Design a protein around this nucleic acid. Structure first.
Ligand SMILES: [Mg+2]
Ligand SMILES: [Mg+2]
Ligand code: NA
Length: 224
DNA sequence: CCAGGCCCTCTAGGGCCTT
């Protein structure tokens, strides 16, 4: 009564109109899909530095939220309702759903979604947006949040460190990342962080990834 | 107008972490 272990890890990041307190909406989603084999033995260039897996599927979609950005969100994301409208981007709609579902169906399953603080932000927000359209992901889809995962892995060998995405990248690579609060930029940063601890995080996923079906919506979406 | 599960510090209080 067990599905096989996850075969593709789909790294996820959302830019949105704000934090959960204001019922945010997705303005940009980026997904990097990586086969498990690329994670079990991370590819490195001749200098010994991590490289992006060669066989990598990618999807980035911008979309216009129904309700306004907070000023802070517009600032850090470089996005606004006007700029998204001006570039002809509709809201989170059937086309997003169909594109996303096609993209996931291109991956060898089962799929493990990966997002930083995903349990508290990206997964419930994505769940809300999909729910509003009555859309579903594959039933054997599971979810890994690198925040409690890295915290738990570190605790596993401990006899107040920051686990923000930026602090983790700084700690592991001793340098600053690029394109912060661009969805694609922050997925890239997340993937590098994951690759740095890949065997540990794979083991964690295999044991503790949560079923997508257990993810609850951040908020109940209004009707139109 | 203003989240919440988590974690660690004087077990209730406070900050983290996501935009
Ligand atoms: Mg994020
Ligand atoms: Mg981001
Ligand atoms: Na981007």
């Amino acid at each position: 009564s067990e599905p096989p272990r996850a075969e593709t890890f789909v790294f996820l990041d959302l830019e949105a109109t704000g934090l959960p307190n204001m019922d945010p909406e997705i303005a940009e989603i980026s997904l990097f899909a990586v086969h498990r084999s690329s994670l079990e033995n991370p590819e490195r260039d001749d200098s010994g530095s991590l490289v992006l897996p060669r066989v990598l599927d990618k999807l980035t979609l911008c979309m216009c939220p129904e309700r306004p950005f907070t000023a802070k969100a517009s600032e850090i994301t470089g996005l606004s309702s006007e700029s998204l409208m001006h570039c002809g981007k509709a809201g989170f709609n059937g086309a997003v759903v169909r594109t996303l579902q096609g993209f996931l169906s291109r991956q060898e399953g089962p799929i493990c979604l990966v997002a930083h603080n995903g349990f508290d932000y990206d997964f419930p927000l994505l769940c809300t947006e999909l729910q509003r359209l009555g859309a579903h992901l594959p039933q054997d889809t599971v979810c890994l949040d690198t925040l409690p995962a890295l915290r738990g892995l570190d605790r596993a060998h401990s006899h107040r460190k920051s686990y923000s995405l930026a602090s983790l990248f700084h700690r592991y690579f001793q340098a600053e990342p690029s394109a912060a609060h661009s969805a694609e930029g922050d997925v890239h940063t997340l993937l590098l962080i994951f690759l740095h601890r890949a065997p540990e995080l794979l083991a964690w996923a295999d044991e503790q990834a949560r079923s997508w079906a257990h993810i609850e919506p951040m908020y109940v979406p209004p009707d139109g």
